[PDB]
Amino acid sequence: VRKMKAIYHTLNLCNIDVTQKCLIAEVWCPVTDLDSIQFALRRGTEHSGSTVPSILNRMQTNQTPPTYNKTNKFTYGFQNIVDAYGIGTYREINPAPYT
Amino acid sequence: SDADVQKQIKHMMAFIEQEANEKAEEIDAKAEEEFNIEKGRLVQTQRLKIMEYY
Amino acid sequence: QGIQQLLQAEKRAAEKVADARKRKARRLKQAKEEAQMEVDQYRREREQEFQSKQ
Amino acid sequence: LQTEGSQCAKTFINLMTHISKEQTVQYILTLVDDTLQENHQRNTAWSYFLPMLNRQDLFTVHMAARIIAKLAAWGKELMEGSDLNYYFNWIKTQLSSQSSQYVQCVAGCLQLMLRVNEYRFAWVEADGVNCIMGVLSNKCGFQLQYQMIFSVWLLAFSPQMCEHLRRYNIIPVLSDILQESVKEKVTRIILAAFRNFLEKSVERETRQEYALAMIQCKVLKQLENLEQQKYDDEDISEDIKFLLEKLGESVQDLSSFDEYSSELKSGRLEWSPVHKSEKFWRENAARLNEKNYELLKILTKLLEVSDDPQVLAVAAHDVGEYVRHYPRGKRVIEQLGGKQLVMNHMHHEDQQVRYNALLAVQKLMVHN
Amino acid sequence: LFRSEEMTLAQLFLQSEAAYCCVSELGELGKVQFRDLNPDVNVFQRKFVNEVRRCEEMDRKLRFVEKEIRKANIPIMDTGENPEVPFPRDMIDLEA
């Protein structure tokens, strides 16, 4: 039930639904992680019984992107110690491998 | 893959004919109550006027 | 982008429902006026028993 | 461009048959389907084109089925219903679910024939309606189920056909399709199929379609949250409010005690919504004493002499709800010794009659 | 890992029938940042505020049972196994 509440919470976060009877979502995602989401979304719509595969359009806007760091079980403590003072911007050098 | 803009016009326009035909053929099939059984209201009314001459 | 292709596509899918909403309010008037064409015709359906009892 | 197509049809009909080039004949048949889709007359020749069709090619079997549905469902003098009972048997093998890539298309050709009224009477008699029940059993009914529910929705208009289709398990099989509700257009036609069923019956046998169909199934509890959802199509929002008001009376109109008296005096004591409803037991507080408290004594008598693996839990529930609503009835069952019967029946091996009699014996002694 | 990870702002096109199944499979993967398209709306009229109430009362009754078992001291085993997401056709059956 706590999963199903979360999916219905982020569908409230999803499309205005004025455009069609379908949902549009502008999500951020890693560029090098893009084969894994498309392989999951292709078989994710198969469970619903739909013959129409959902598609993924790439945008070229100018909104500021968030940061992301590959986080292990070891380097998580050294990451949030650096992250406590200030979040890093897009593609600044993370001092956490040096920390 | 540049085929996404083709895949967009592929099956999302196939959703249009799902709304186009199958919703209008629903309304086109709503004639048995709006034409056929409303035919039976007045032809039973003027069936009295056959009998009053009869 | 893709939603600009979907805005007029939704509109033509809404329009194909919209003219179905109006031909069902048009034939509905004709359904009452085709049911009173028997007034011209079912008096001739009365006419066959006029010769029969005569 | 509009070229008063009237003449040269006999030259086209002779060309459609005699040509061994099946690639060109499929193109000849597709031009006839495209042109006659929005226009008038092109039915002895319609019977003549049927024998040359339905043979040895995947394109001509459904393209002729497109044009023979357009010919049969349109026209006054072109209405040739004697040829219709001829036609159904040839394509009934193709109407079976053993074909691939064409089960969706001939269902669309089937809907055109099932549109007009007189065509439906000759259909269901020659049918063996199990062809619909075959595909309604799980066979990937994403679009296929929408086509077949649209077919039976057409079959609900004429009143005498409603008592023809009721010799089956239709509506709880259909409510099993309703609880899925993934396509969001199958639910708009299967709620309309529930309305066209229920509205067009001139009988008291609409109550046959509650007990099989509505009150004894997981549909009326589903219709409460169907109202809570946010549908856009305005006929759906009036379809639910029509079904909720038709089934809103349908729970308490047998929740009368008469029926319950028809249940108690005749026996068999089945599971019914009259037992779980508290507005039933709000009404018949003194009605067991209106029957001179025999009506309770006939209920503990069937509780006594019979083992009843199912309806004893109903009988244990019936004495429990009365006792909570009349404290003097606790003294009544003491004079009959029915409390010691529930004491024995709560120790039964079955868990349903154990759980119901445990609530029954604990309602007897709330206060002493 | 001295430079960063780089983000895309891709755009999803999820169908109405494939609206629960894809997002639930995206949550098991866990690499998306769903952004608010309409921030200027209230807490209701978000198309799915009806059953997110119903998931909260299903959570409310389940918090009551979890209080009840530990009050009776029957400590429940975990047996760590992450289950799969329940479909909405199982959601109606869950309240019963």
XYZ file of C-alpha atoms in Angstrom:
671
model
C 0.000 0.000 0.000
C 2.919 2.371 0.610
C 4.215 1.685 -2.896
C 0.773 2.200 -4.447
C 0.354 5.475 -2.558
C 3.694 6.630 -3.988
C 2.781 5.800 -7.595
C -0.538 7.599 -7.231
C 1.308 10.510 -5.615
C 3.625 10.900 -8.611
C 0.722 10.546 -11.033
C -0.658 13.620 -9.287
C 2.783 15.048 -10.146
C 2.191 13.902 -13.750
C 0.436 15.499 -16.741
C -2.211 18.221 -16.798
C -4.033 15.629 -19.036
C -5.591 18.434 -21.131
C -3.575 17.398 -24.198
C -4.989 13.889 -24.696
C -6.167 10.830 -22.759
C -2.543 10.033 -21.945
C 0.116 11.165 -19.491
C 3.156 13.306 -20.299
C 6.080 13.516 -17.892
C 9.205 15.681 -18.126
C 11.586 13.529 -16.090
C 15.312 13.951 -15.589
C 17.468 10.902 -16.234
C 21.159 10.037 -16.723
C 22.309 10.020 -20.342
C 24.516 6.951 -19.951
C 21.721 5.159 -18.061
C 19.298 5.505 -20.981
C 19.368 1.949 -22.322
C 18.168 0.490 -19.016
C 15.096 2.723 -18.699
C 14.051 2.021 -22.301
C 14.477 -1.730 -21.827
C 12.332 -1.537 -18.679
C 9.656 0.750 -20.140
C 9.262 -1.483 -23.206
C 8.300 -4.460 -21.035
C 6.664 -2.257 -18.403
C 3.783 -1.419 -20.734
C 3.521 -5.105 -21.689
C 2.103 -5.954 -18.249
C -0.827 -3.592 -18.842
C -1.773 -5.473 -22.018
C -1.171 -2.498 -24.322
C 0.064 -2.995 -27.878
C 1.240 0.645 -27.976
C 4.767 1.112 -26.558
C 5.400 4.299 -24.611
C 8.032 6.562 -26.143
C 10.768 8.804 -24.754
C 11.390 12.183 -26.400
C 14.614 14.032 -25.585
C 14.388 17.785 -25.000
C 16.935 20.578 -25.431
C 15.657 23.188 -22.979
C 17.677 25.553 -20.790
C 16.376 24.725 -17.307
C 19.162 23.972 -14.846
C 19.695 20.226 -14.354
C 20.230 18.608 -10.953
C 23.462 16.932 -9.947
C 24.002 13.195 -9.593
C 26.911 11.183 -8.204
C 27.485 7.436 -8.412
C 27.126 6.446 -4.780
C 28.530 3.316 -3.151
C 28.091 1.935 0.341
C 31.558 3.289 1.197
C 31.622 6.742 -0.422
C 28.142 7.773 0.767
C 29.493 9.059 4.077
C 32.095 11.190 2.323
C 29.498 12.441 -0.162
C 26.906 13.897 2.217
C 29.664 15.442 4.348
C 30.622 17.491 1.289
C 26.953 17.895 0.340
C 26.010 19.297 3.769
C 27.696 22.650 3.106
C 26.394 23.095 -0.429
C 24.951 21.014 -3.251
C 27.242 20.834 -6.265
C 26.111 22.412 -9.520
C 26.085 20.748 -12.931
C 29.466 19.128 -13.708
C 31.576 20.820 -11.056
C 34.397 18.642 -9.760
C 33.165 16.691 -6.760
C 35.697 16.994 -3.903
C 34.309 13.763 -2.402
C 36.904 11.447 -4.060
C 39.536 13.751 -2.547
C 37.639 13.978 0.756
C 17.124 6.620 -32.745
C 15.393 9.318 -34.802
C 12.404 6.998 -35.320
C 10.618 8.348 -32.214
C 8.970 11.160 -34.190
C 7.794 8.453 -36.587
C 6.753 6.227 -33.663
C 4.801 9.194 -32.275
C 2.791 9.552 -35.489
C 2.572 5.742 -35.753
C 0.441 4.698 -32.803
C -0.784 7.900 -31.144
C -2.631 8.618 -34.383
C -3.878 5.038 -34.126
C -5.437 6.168 -30.846
C -7.302 8.818 -32.849
C -9.181 6.266 -34.974
C -9.907 4.443 -31.715
C -11.695 7.620 -30.617
C -12.895 8.507 -34.128
C -14.702 5.398 -35.338
C -15.430 3.306 -32.244
C -16.991 6.255 -30.416
C -19.013 7.483 -33.413
C -20.159 3.968 -34.342
C -21.384 3.831 -30.741
C -23.541 6.893 -31.443
C -24.399 5.523 -34.900
C -25.612 2.349 -33.181
C -27.741 4.480 -30.838
C -30.491 4.651 -33.478
C -32.502 1.615 -32.351
C -33.815 3.695 -29.442
C -33.576 7.130 -31.061
C -35.047 6.222 -34.482
C -36.508 2.712 -34.318
C -38.330 2.697 -30.986
C -39.392 6.315 -31.489
C -40.804 5.123 -34.799
C -43.015 2.792 -32.770
C -44.486 5.622 -30.698
C -46.263 7.463 -33.515
C -47.085 4.512 -35.802
C -48.972 3.037 -32.851
C -50.638 6.439 -32.449
C -51.906 6.561 -36.036
C -52.790 2.862 -35.806
C -55.765 4.157 -33.808
C -56.719 6.325 -36.794
C -56.722 3.205 -38.966
C -59.161 1.548 -36.553
C -61.472 4.562 -36.198
C -62.027 4.431 -39.958
C -62.250 0.637 -39.738
C 7.687 19.101 -30.369
C 5.438 16.064 -29.993
C 2.549 17.669 -28.099
C 2.080 20.180 -30.920
C 1.313 17.190 -33.133
C -1.058 15.913 -30.415
C -3.060 19.118 -29.917
C -4.657 19.195 -33.373
C -4.892 15.389 -33.337
C -6.961 15.537 -30.148
C -9.100 18.254 -31.750
C -9.911 16.162 -34.829
C -10.717 13.235 -32.529
C -12.990 15.545 -30.539
C -14.495 16.859 -33.783
C -15.289 13.328 -34.979
C -17.249 12.882 -31.758
C -18.771 16.362 -32.152
C -20.503 15.839 -35.505
C -21.825 12.520 -34.194
C -23.414 14.537 -31.372
C -25.252 16.660 -33.951
C -26.438 14.032 -36.449
C -28.113 12.266 -33.513
C -29.976 15.498 -32.695
C -30.822 15.924 -36.400
C -32.130 12.443 -37.260
C -34.070 12.617 -33.968
C -36.214 15.351 -35.510
C -36.420 13.307 -38.719
C -37.396 10.209 -36.709
C -40.559 11.993 -35.595
C -41.204 13.291 -39.120
C -40.621 9.914 -40.799
C -43.065 8.320 -38.337
C -45.787 10.671 -39.598
C -45.156 9.721 -43.239
C -47.386 6.740 -42.424
C -50.240 9.278 -42.223
C -49.890 9.615 -46.006
C -49.430 5.854 -46.385
C -51.211 3.795 -43.721
C -54.564 5.207 -44.780
C -53.856 3.244 -47.962
C -53.080 0.331 -45.644
C -56.611 0.961 -44.373
C -57.818 0.978 -47.992
C -57.374 -2.762 -48.626
C -59.965 -3.699 -46.003
C -62.318 -1.028 -47.355
C -62.537 -3.085 -50.552
C -62.645 -6.323 -48.542
C -65.747 -5.534 -46.475
C -67.438 -3.937 -49.500
C -14.695 12.928 -59.194
C -18.237 11.753 -58.275
C -18.688 10.681 -61.940
C -22.404 9.777 -61.579
C -21.209 6.261 -60.851
C -24.390 4.457 -61.905
C -23.652 2.485 -65.074
C -20.834 -0.047 -65.777
C -21.457 -1.927 -62.504
C -22.285 -5.140 -64.381
C -18.987 -4.819 -66.245
C -17.234 -4.309 -62.902
C -19.041 -7.251 -61.278
C -18.071 -9.512 -64.174
C -14.487 -8.251 -63.897
C -14.402 -8.875 -60.140
C -15.016 -12.609 -60.602
C -13.288 -13.754 -63.808
C -9.755 -12.458 -63.244
C -7.074 -14.923 -62.150
C -4.748 -12.108 -61.009
C -5.545 -12.163 -57.292
C -3.292 -9.149 -56.683
C -5.349 -7.068 -59.111
C -8.613 -8.592 -57.859
C -7.696 -7.540 -54.319
C -7.075 -4.046 -55.694
C -10.402 -4.228 -57.549
C -12.157 -5.257 -54.329
C -10.399 -2.530 -52.313
C -11.508 0.155 -54.773
C -15.086 -1.096 -54.416
C -14.823 -0.998 -50.615
C -13.336 2.509 -50.646
C -15.913 3.976 -53.041
C -19.088 2.351 -51.688
C -18.195 3.145 -48.057
C -19.831 6.588 -48.268
C -22.334 6.133 -51.115
C -25.418 4.220 -52.248
C -26.366 1.129 -54.352
C -23.788 -0.847 -56.339
C -29.175 -8.386 -53.951
C -28.870 -11.363 -56.292
C -25.453 -10.093 -57.390
C -24.533 -9.779 -53.708
C -25.211 -13.498 -53.336
C -23.253 -14.068 -56.560
C -20.113 -12.312 -55.292
C -20.240 -14.332 -52.055
C -19.494 -17.708 -53.731
C -16.457 -16.361 -55.596
C -15.281 -14.900 -52.268
C -14.449 -16.611 -48.945
C -11.735 -18.718 -50.594
C -7.947 -19.236 -50.645
C -6.736 -15.653 -50.078
C -6.356 -13.571 -46.924
C -7.141 -10.228 -48.560
C -10.363 -11.059 -50.403
C -12.055 -12.817 -47.470
C -12.383 -9.724 -45.281
C -12.569 -7.143 -48.079
C -15.661 -8.929 -49.393
C -16.821 -9.144 -45.769
C -16.479 -5.357 -45.639
C -18.604 -4.872 -48.748
C -21.163 -7.576 -47.970
C -21.741 -5.954 -44.570
C -22.198 -2.586 -46.275
C -24.644 -4.160 -48.728
C -26.675 -6.045 -46.122
C -26.948 -3.302 -43.479
C -27.895 -0.558 -45.965
C -30.931 -0.363 -48.217
C -34.674 -0.981 -47.976
C -35.218 -3.262 -50.976
C -31.612 -4.419 -50.488
C -32.685 -5.961 -47.159
C -32.483 -9.650 -48.097
C -32.645 -11.486 -44.731
C -33.254 -14.839 -46.430
C -29.700 -14.527 -47.773
C -28.566 -13.519 -44.270
C -29.295 -16.893 -42.657
C -27.481 -18.369 -45.650
C -24.434 -16.119 -45.095
C -23.759 -16.709 -41.376
C -22.830 -20.389 -41.690
C -20.033 -19.924 -44.246
C -18.048 -17.397 -42.196
C -18.869 -19.009 -38.817
C -15.670 -21.039 -39.199
C -13.833 -17.751 -39.758
C -15.816 -16.209 -36.880
C -14.233 -18.837 -34.632
C -11.186 -17.834 -32.591
C -8.752 -20.161 -34.402
C -7.623 -17.441 -36.832
C -4.806 -14.896 -36.388
C -4.609 -11.251 -37.605
C -8.293 -11.320 -38.650
C -10.241 -12.023 -35.429
C -10.474 -8.262 -34.867
C -11.605 -7.392 -38.396
C -14.485 -9.848 -38.880
C -15.803 -8.784 -35.472
C -16.064 -5.332 -37.027
C -17.905 -6.856 -39.979
C -20.105 -8.673 -37.453
C -21.157 -5.388 -35.818
C -22.562 -4.014 -39.080
C -24.840 -7.033 -39.486
C -25.896 -6.888 -35.825
C -26.881 -3.209 -36.123
C -30.300 -3.432 -37.801
C -33.126 -4.954 -35.747
C -34.547 -7.843 -37.816
C -31.026 -9.098 -38.575
C -30.516 -9.733 -34.852
C -33.443 -12.153 -34.427
C -32.176 -14.501 -37.134
C -28.645 -14.155 -35.741
C -29.098 -15.374 -32.161
C -31.352 -18.283 -33.177
C -28.778 -19.644 -35.631
C -25.881 -18.462 -33.422
C -24.937 -20.793 -30.673
C -23.872 -17.672 -28.738
C -20.883 -19.554 -27.179
C -18.720 -18.073 -29.964
C -18.979 -14.839 -27.985
C -18.436 -16.829 -24.774
C -15.341 -18.427 -26.291
C -13.594 -15.108 -26.873
C -14.994 -13.687 -23.628
C -12.998 -16.409 -21.925
C -9.446 -15.094 -21.648
C -7.914 -14.970 -25.135
C -6.174 -11.547 -25.025
C -9.329 -9.452 -25.172
C -7.804 -5.981 -25.359
C -9.679 -4.852 -28.472
C -11.434 -8.200 -29.035
C -13.535 -7.895 -25.877
C -14.622 -4.365 -26.827
C -15.916 -5.660 -30.160
C -17.928 -8.468 -28.570
C -19.449 -6.420 -25.742
C -20.498 -3.933 -28.439
C -22.192 -6.862 -30.191
C -24.207 -7.975 -27.162
C -25.027 -4.320 -26.388
C -26.775 -4.295 -29.764
C -28.663 -7.466 -28.743
C -30.333 -5.752 -25.771
C -32.633 -3.359 -27.645
C -35.510 -5.651 -28.619
C -37.397 -6.783 -25.488
C -38.054 -10.446 -26.329
C -34.370 -10.980 -27.123
C -33.507 -10.085 -23.524
C -35.275 -13.205 -22.252
C -33.555 -15.124 -25.054
C -30.031 -14.155 -23.953
C -30.710 -14.931 -20.271
C -30.153 -18.700 -20.697
C -26.491 -18.277 -19.717
C -24.136 -16.852 -17.089
C -23.718 -13.603 -19.067
C -23.520 -10.771 -16.546
C -21.139 -12.208 -13.881
C -18.906 -13.237 -16.798
C -19.290 -9.651 -18.013
C -18.677 -8.228 -14.533
C -15.399 -10.168 -14.509
C -14.496 -8.056 -17.535
C -15.721 -4.943 -15.693
C -13.403 -5.368 -12.696
C -10.337 -5.290 -14.959
C -11.237 -1.891 -16.513
C -7.926 -1.275 -18.254
C -9.079 -0.129 -21.703
C -11.432 2.688 -20.432
C -13.714 2.063 -23.429
C -14.685 -1.504 -22.544
C -16.166 -0.147 -19.308
C -18.168 2.506 -21.171
C -19.935 -0.106 -23.296
C -20.282 -2.804 -20.627
C -22.008 -0.291 -18.366
C -24.207 0.632 -21.323
C -24.821 -3.092 -21.831
C -25.978 -3.225 -18.212
C -28.354 -0.323 -18.851
C -29.785 -1.607 -22.145
C -30.317 -4.958 -20.438
C -32.053 -3.508 -17.394
C -34.086 -0.736 -19.038
C -35.622 -2.763 -21.882
C -37.388 -5.507 -19.907
C -41.179 -5.626 -19.813
C -41.602 -8.241 -17.044
C -40.809 -8.797 -13.378
C -37.806 -10.841 -14.556
C -35.438 -7.913 -14.126
C -35.052 -9.469 -10.669
C -33.647 -12.517 -12.457
C -30.916 -10.112 -13.596
C -30.134 -8.912 -10.110
C -29.726 -12.280 -8.325
C -27.667 -13.866 -11.092
C -26.339 -10.479 -12.166
C -26.207 -7.441 -9.928
C -26.706 -7.834 -6.182
C -24.967 -11.219 -5.896
C -21.767 -10.188 -7.676
C -18.786 -7.859 -7.274
C -20.366 -5.139 -9.419
C -22.579 -3.071 -7.089
C -19.724 -2.639 -4.616
C -17.587 -1.633 -7.608
C -20.137 0.941 -8.789
C -19.613 3.045 -5.650
C -16.007 3.797 -6.609
C -17.034 4.055 -10.273
C -18.981 7.145 -9.199
C -15.921 8.468 -7.365
C -13.750 8.450 -10.501
C -13.443 11.432 -12.823
C -14.772 10.330 -16.228
C -15.159 12.893 -19.017
C -17.757 11.318 -21.350
C -21.087 12.663 -20.114
C -23.128 9.536 -20.881
C -20.959 7.497 -18.489
C -21.671 9.858 -15.576
C -25.393 9.382 -16.228
C -24.924 5.643 -16.813
C -23.636 5.129 -13.265
C -26.342 7.290 -11.680
C -28.995 5.370 -13.601
C -27.503 2.049 -12.488
C -27.038 3.239 -8.901
C -30.673 4.321 -8.628
C -31.933 1.135 -10.298
C -29.842 -1.049 -8.001
C -30.363 1.251 -5.026
C -33.972 0.127 -4.784
C -33.012 -3.417 -5.815
C -31.341 -4.268 -2.511
C -34.277 -3.395 -0.244
C -37.178 -4.458 -2.448
C -36.588 -8.110 -1.441
C -35.180 -7.021 1.819
C -38.825 -7.060 2.783
C -38.970 -10.190 4.942
C -41.498 -11.579 2.584
C -38.793 -12.980 0.494
C -37.133 -13.777 3.635
C -40.407 -15.458 4.580
C -40.289 -17.065 1.135
C -36.758 -18.145 2.044
C -37.627 -19.328 5.558
C -40.880 -21.182 4.841
C -39.659 -22.922 1.679
C -36.179 -23.507 3.087
C -32.672 -23.677 1.569
C -31.738 -20.378 3.340
C -29.292 -19.051 0.749
C -26.670 -16.310 1.011
C -28.497 -13.108 0.095
C -27.923 -9.363 0.637
C -31.073 -9.309 2.810
C -29.070 -10.950 5.608
C -26.075 -8.603 5.702
C -28.195 -5.451 5.367
C -28.996 -3.872 8.723
C -32.002 -1.993 7.317
C -33.635 -5.412 6.987
C -33.084 -6.127 10.688
C -34.027 -2.545 11.563
C -37.501 -3.271 10.141
C -38.351 -6.828 11.227
C -37.713 -6.330 14.943
C -41.086 -7.663 16.089
C -41.975 -9.541 12.905
C -40.856 -12.881 14.340
C -43.308 -12.129 17.151
C -45.899 -11.081 14.553
C -45.703 -14.733 13.501
C -46.311 -15.869 17.142
C -42.739 -16.653 17.886
C -42.874 -19.721 15.489
C -40.994 -17.705 12.814
C -37.982 -17.958 15.108
C -39.009 -21.480 16.137
C -39.143 -22.591 12.502
C -35.623 -21.172 12.075
C -34.092 -23.026 15.016
C -35.926 -26.162 13.845
C -34.071 -26.180 10.523
C -30.974 -25.327 12.572
C -31.643 -28.451 14.652
C -32.466 -31.331 12.324
C -30.039 -30.562 9.484
C -26.253 -30.416 9.156
C -26.183 -27.811 6.316
C -22.505 -27.085 5.423
C -23.388 -23.668 3.935
C -26.744 -22.325 5.161
C -26.193 -23.095 8.855
C -23.859 -20.094 8.934
C -26.745 -18.096 7.460
C -29.095 -19.523 10.100
C -26.596 -18.717 12.851
C -26.334 -15.174 11.487
C -30.118 -14.741 11.474
C -30.567 -15.444 15.182
C -27.629 -13.164 15.974
C -28.942 -10.010 14.317
C -32.410 -10.367 15.856
C -31.017 -10.745 19.386
C -29.049 -7.487 19.147
C -32.252 -5.658 18.163
C -34.593 -7.226 20.754
C -33.267 -8.058 24.239
C -36.322 -10.167 25.105
C -35.424 -12.572 22.291
C -32.505 -13.789 24.408
C -35.058 -15.261 26.811
C -36.961 -16.720 23.843
C -34.106 -18.898 22.569
C -33.464 -20.040 26.154
C -36.972 -21.522 26.262
C -36.313 -23.285 22.944
C -32.838 -24.525 23.890
C -31.339 -23.080 20.715
C -28.367 -21.669 22.639
C -27.074 -25.181 23.351
C -27.440 -25.926 19.635
C -25.174 -22.974 18.766
C -22.827 -24.250 21.508
C -22.578 -27.519 19.583
C -22.488 -25.933 16.122
C -19.677 -23.528 17.028
C -17.448 -26.547 17.671
C -18.051 -27.777 14.091
C -15.197 -28.773 11.784
C -16.088 -26.157 9.161
C -14.667 -22.701 9.786
C -17.503 -20.636 8.298
C -20.170 -22.120 10.563
C -17.704 -21.860 13.453
C -17.055 -18.140 12.933
C -20.743 -17.309 12.477
C -21.884 -19.289 15.525
C -19.131 -17.733 17.652
C -20.539 -14.301 16.839
C -24.024 -15.720 17.423
C -23.252 -17.126 20.873
C -21.445 -13.940 21.935
C -24.427 -11.801 20.911
C -26.668 -13.833 23.228
C -24.731 -12.857 26.356
C -23.759 -9.189 25.916
C -25.334 -8.120 29.216
C -27.029 -11.114 30.987
C 34.232 9.824 -10.567
C 35.772 13.279 -10.636
C 33.519 14.959 -13.195
C 29.798 14.257 -12.564
C 26.806 12.419 -13.915
C 24.952 14.212 -16.727
C 21.169 14.652 -16.904
C 18.842 14.815 -19.894
C 15.300 16.087 -19.181
C 13.694 13.504 -21.402
C 9.939 13.538 -21.986
C 7.581 10.625 -21.353
C 4.419 9.740 -23.273
C 2.493 7.352 -21.034
C -0.858 5.995 -22.147
C -3.931 5.901 -19.923
C -3.975 2.101 -19.775
C -0.185 1.966 -19.382
C -0.089 4.615 -16.662
C 0.236 2.478 -13.533
C 2.405 -0.335 -14.889
C 5.195 1.776 -16.399
C 5.597 4.180 -13.468
C 5.641 1.243 -11.036
C 8.414 -0.379 -13.070
C 10.234 2.963 -13.151
C 10.151 3.012 -9.355
C 11.860 -0.370 -9.107
C 14.568 0.933 -11.438
C 14.768 4.227 -9.554
C 16.553 6.721 -11.820
C 13.883 9.325 -12.674
C 13.116 12.867 -11.466
C 9.432 13.490 -12.273
C 8.952 17.258 -12.441
C 5.758 19.153 -11.647
C 4.051 20.298 -14.835
C 1.248 22.155 -13.024
C 2.436 23.748 -9.760
C -0.394 26.300 -9.704
C -3.173 23.883 -8.701
C -4.490 22.856 -5.290
C -4.017 19.535 -3.501
C -7.102 18.038 -5.204
C -8.067 18.101 -8.999
C -4.858 16.174 -9.775
C -6.813 13.356 -11.566
C -5.738 10.711 -9.019
C -6.619 12.306 -5.666
C -9.590 9.964 -5.292
C -7.792 6.685 -4.592
C -4.757 8.270 -2.945
C -7.286 8.936 -0.200
C -8.243 5.249 -0.324
C -4.598 4.203 -0.076
C -4.313 6.324 3.071
C -7.256 4.658 4.818
C -5.823 1.305 3.748
C -2.644 2.556 5.400
C -4.662 3.855 8.369
C -6.245 0.466 9.032
C -2.868 -1.233 8.586
C -1.270 1.080 11.152
C -4.061 0.060 13.535
C -3.368 -3.659 13.083
C 0.387 -3.138 13.572
C -0.421 -1.492 16.901
C -2.716 -4.409 17.760
C -0.257 -7.279 17.245
C 2.559 -5.719 19.281
C 0.030 -4.973 22.024
C -0.691 -8.719 22.096
C 3.066 -9.484 21.714
C 3.207 -11.693 18.614
C 6.522 -10.506 17.066
C 6.265 -10.894 13.311
C 9.057 -12.357 11.193
C 10.322 -10.231 8.309
C 11.703 -12.913 5.916
C 13.216 -10.257 3.660
C 11.762 -10.490 0.170
C 10.750 -7.371 -1.762
C 7.322 -8.092 -3.303
C 6.074 -6.837 -6.643
C 3.681 -3.911 -7.062
C -0.046 -4.821 -6.913
C -2.158 -3.997 -9.964
C -5.286 -1.807 -9.588
C -7.459 -4.833 -10.387
C -6.097 -6.192 -7.097
C -6.759 -2.857 -5.370
C -10.532 -3.388 -5.118
C -9.912 -6.883 -3.728
C -7.493 -5.499 -1.121
C -10.059 -3.401 0.764
C -12.335 -6.437 1.121
